[PDB]
Ligand binder design. Sequence first.
Ligand SMILES: Nc1ccc(S(=O)(=O)Nc2nccs2)cc1
Ligand SMILES: COc1ccc(O)c2nc(C)c(C)nc12
Ligand SMILES: OCc1ccc(-c2cncnc2)cc1
Ligand code: NA
Lengths: 245, 12
Amino acid sequence: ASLTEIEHLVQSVCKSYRETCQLRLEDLLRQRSNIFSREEVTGYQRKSMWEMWERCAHHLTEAIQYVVEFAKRLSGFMELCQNDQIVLLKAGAMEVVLVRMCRAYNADNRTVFFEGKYGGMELFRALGCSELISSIFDFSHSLSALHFSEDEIALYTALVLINAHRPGLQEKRKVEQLQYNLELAFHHHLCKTHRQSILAKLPPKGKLRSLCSQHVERLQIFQHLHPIVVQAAFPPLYKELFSGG
Amino acid sequence: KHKILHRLLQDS
Ligand SMILES: Nc1ccc(S(=O)(=O)Nc2nccs2)cc1
Ligand SMILES: COc1ccc(O)c2nc(C)c(C)nc12
Ligand SMILES: OCc1ccc(-c2cncnc2)cc1
Ligand code: NA
């Protein structure tokens, strides 16, 4: 792609990102002092493991629906065959959610916006996946230290999704070309805003895959203990992406 | 198989 086309690509991705976020960044920032009390935290800690998993799977499913809408607005995504669209979303939707979540993370007090207020990782104790929760909090903390703009997250998440290395891609060369153009848009934007210093600080190739693999593993453990809860009370989209339907 | 995703990608 030429220069004018790259700038158009940057504008298009940033607009697609802003239009596909449930909450405005300004809404999240204005809620920072709205923190769960010690009584409310104890309340979440006293919830049954199955109740907390159900609540978390519903919130993750809603976040994924927004990621699907984001993918659909990406130039070239809708021109790929359905097999490749599905391969990219199944491999990348959770990774996009993990990156987007730093917008709802307050590095000042290590809290996340969850169910209307900010709370620390202790809110999630009843899930019984402490190692995964602390790794997600560590990841959001590491991204927050980069001070990403909303435009930087938009371009980086388009790249998390448009990855030609995903196994199962039928039109690999077509995805390599969309990836190259998105990489140019991302690097052009960083060069234009004097933010190329972040390139070295972006998470390593393998960190997102590790977090996604841990999520799937913890789900399998929960599913063995509460199979009827997953079958009857988890969203169908969640099961499609994480437990093969 | 992939019922929901197929519907979301078709739903225009
Ligand atoms: N509780 C809550 C917190 C953040 C958001 S979001 O609008 O930032 N969308 C996101 N999607 C993925 C990560 S953040 C929605 C609900
Ligand atoms: C913005 O952070 C979140 C929002 C909503 C959730 O259900 C979350 N559920 C979990 C488990 C974690 C770590 N973060 C969450
Ligand atoms: O347990 C993994 C997990 C669950 C939910 C979320 C999430 C949902 N909605 C907004 N931000 C983040 C992220 C990771
Ligand atoms: Na943040």
